[PDB]
């Protein structure tokens, strides 16, 4: 090694520094919070009725165990796009809460359901924040939503004196004023009803056909994760150089006991270089330090 480091077959007397070494890790451990029930996620997809964009519908999911792989075996979705997380690795993660939003839209307006878009939908009906992580799903429902008699129940806010806030909900239906003299609860040229019906007809060109859309938001906080993928827990080992994954966070190191007086609302601590130093295990209240494995020249 010395010879090949100097590009020469002969070396003079001396001390040569040519390489470094690291202790390799010897075991891998997995330690996930144990949830004792399946997840009724199908409720949000198997439902007959559906919401209207003026009053979109939300569901909050917690305490669940769910496998997303089926969503990639299924081919019933006209559109499937996720942002901020790789869709294949969702089985290896955990979250504090999951939120589902649901509504029917004009297919032409699918362009509007993205962070930072603009238009009547993105400003008067369902404004989405510019910073986002989640996934968005659509499928065409023209067969069921529309009928030979037409369907006109679905309404969208046509006019609005302002633009909504992100995830804002507003059932107020004050008569919109487009005239010099304001009129309240009156039908006239000055003011008219602020919502317009979607006229869904069964022969409409595809762009006008109704598409059902659902948006899934993953939310994670120092509040301990309650929903996790179907991964399995494993025994715990200490004072040896080991690979670990706690609650979605991977790494390698030497786990040890610690005397850090974490408060009940806290989970982990960070060093100046912004790396994890100590953690609270999801199955016991003990606090563990992580120390890197030995290395040197």
């Amino acid at each position, epitope marked *: 090694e010395t010879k090949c480091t100097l590009k020469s077959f002969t070396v003079e007397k001396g001390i040569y520094q040519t390489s470094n070494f690291r202790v390799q890790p010897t075991e891998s451990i997995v330690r996930f919070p144990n*949830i*004792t029930n*399946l997840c*009724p*996620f*199908g409720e949000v997809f*198997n439902a007959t009725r559906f919401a209207s964009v003026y009053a979109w519908n939300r569901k909050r999911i917690s305490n669940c165990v769910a*496998d997303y792989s*089926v969503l990639y075996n299924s081919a019933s979705f006209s559109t499937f796009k996720c942002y901020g997380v790789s869709p294949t690795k969702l089985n290896d993660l955990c979250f504090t809460n999951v939120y589902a939003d649901s509504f029917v839209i004009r297919g032409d307006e699918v362009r509007q359901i993205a962070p930072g878009q603009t238009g009547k939908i993105a400003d008067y009906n369902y404004k989405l924040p510019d910073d986002f992580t989640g996934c968005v799903i659509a499928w065409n429902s023209n067969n069921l939503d529309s009928k030979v008699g037409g369907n006109y129940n679905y309404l969208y806010r046509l006019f609005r004196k302002s633009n909504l806030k992100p995830f804002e909900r507003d059932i107020s239906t004050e008569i919109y004023q487009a005239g010099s003299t304001p009129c309240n609860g009156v039908e006239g040229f000055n003011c008219y009803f602020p919502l317009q019906s979607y006229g869904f007809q069964p022969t409409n060109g595809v762009g006008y056909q109704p598409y059902r859309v659902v948006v899934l938001s993953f939310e994670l906080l120092h509040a301990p994760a309650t929903v996790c993928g*179907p991964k399995k827990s494993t025994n715990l080992v200490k004072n040896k150089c080991v690979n670990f994954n706690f609650n979605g966070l991977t790494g390698t190191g030497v786990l040890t006991e610690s005397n850090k007086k974490f408060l009940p609302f806290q989970q982990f601590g960070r060093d100046i270089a912004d790396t994890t130093d100590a953690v609270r295990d999801p199955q016991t209240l003990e606090i563990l330090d992580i120390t890197p494995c030995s290395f040197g020249g």
Partner: antibody
Amino acid sequence: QVQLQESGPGLVKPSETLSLTCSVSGGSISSHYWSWIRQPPGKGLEWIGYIYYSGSTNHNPSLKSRVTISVDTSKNQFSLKLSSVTAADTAVYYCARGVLLWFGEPIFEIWGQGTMVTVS
Amino acid sequence: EIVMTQSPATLSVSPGERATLSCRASQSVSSSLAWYQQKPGQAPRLLIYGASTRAPGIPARFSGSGSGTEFTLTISSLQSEDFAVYYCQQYNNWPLTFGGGTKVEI
């Protein structure tokens, strides 16, 4: 956690109605479905119906006119009634909670203790 | 409508050996089965709720796989406490069905 407890008669006469009742403890009928199931002695299981928080319900395709189910919000109780019963209807009856994963039919995960019914 | 059959009706087994079982549906089905254990006089337990996946609380002694025609389940290192009836089930379509079941001896 939740508990399922159930009650009904031990003996019934031919050609008269039969009724059973199952009550939930530790939770409420908010989302998860419920379903009645029967197990004839030494035979395969059979599903007879399911109902959820909305009151909408579906029963076994056969014996369309034989079975009805009513759900009460008060006291977290639901009951089943059969128009009449026969010597073949002797079985253990179970009430069980049902979770809908994604599509199809809901999988039964929590099961009641079961109660025996016989006709003579 | 979907009908389903389970064979054989009984397997003779003695402690310290693996066992294998298979259940078939009249028509193609995938990722839409369950395996239920039935110990004497007990309520059923849900052990397997899909293709090759274990419900939370079930040791890795139980496992299974399958194809559209037939599905199989293996119990490695069978023990005396594994004496039970096993019932395959499907839920892909409205006509729910249970399999015939199999007794596994001591």
